[PDB]
Amino acid sequence: CYIQGCTLS
């Protein structure tokens, strides 16, 4: 994600 308030799931 570009926003890091998003984790690779």
Query: What distance separates the 2 farthest-apart alpha carbons in the chain?
Result: 14
**Residue that has been written with the tokens 């998003």 in this structure:** 6
DSSP state of 8: -
Amino acid at 4: Q
